[PDB]
Amino acid sequence: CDYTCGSNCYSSSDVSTAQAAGYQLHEDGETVGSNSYPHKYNNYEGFDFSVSSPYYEWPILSSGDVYSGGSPGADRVVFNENNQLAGVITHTGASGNNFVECT
Numbered sequence: 001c002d003y004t005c006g007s008n009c010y011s012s013s014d015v016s017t018a019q020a021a022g023y024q025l026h027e028d029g030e031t032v033g034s035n036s037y038p039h040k041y042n043n044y045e046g047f048d049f050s051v052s053s054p055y056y057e058w059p060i061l062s063s064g065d066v067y068s069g070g071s072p073g074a075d076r077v078v079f080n081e082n083n084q085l086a087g088v089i090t091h092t093g094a095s096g097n098n099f100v101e102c103t
């Protein structure tokens, strides 16, 4: 696994595919789903991302398909304004409504 979010296993191609879809919607000024993804990720957790902000979060799904407006699940891809990958985060293993980084 390139990224492990709890029990979910993601390759760098699964991440690139998810990011490309979130980035396109972001540029278009449109969102999908009841929680309106993609949307800004503030970095309250204080992850040390090596690319610049602003950051946006978009769901990445364990099933392998691109998020298509249903349940976002626990996992997210985080990307910035230049379509650079910041990281992959999850609610799995985090307390409250915080996130932890996938490893």
Ligand SMILES: Nc1nc2c(ncn2[C@@H]2O[C@H](CO)[C@@H](O)[C@H]2OP(=O)(O)O)c(=O)[nH]1
Residues within 6 Å of the ligand: 039, 040, 041, 042, 043, 044, 045, 097, 098, 099
């Ligand atoms: N845990 C977490 N939630 C965030 C972050 N950025 C935005 N959100 C949350 O995502 C949702 C969409 O904006 C809001 O509930 C917002 O929470 P706050 O209301 O606390 O800002 C972040 O860095 N961490």
Ligand code: NA
Residues within 6 Å of the ligand: 029, 030, 031
């Ligand atoms: Na809009």
Ligand code: NA
Residues within 6 Å of the ligand: 095, 096
């Ligand atoms: Na809890």
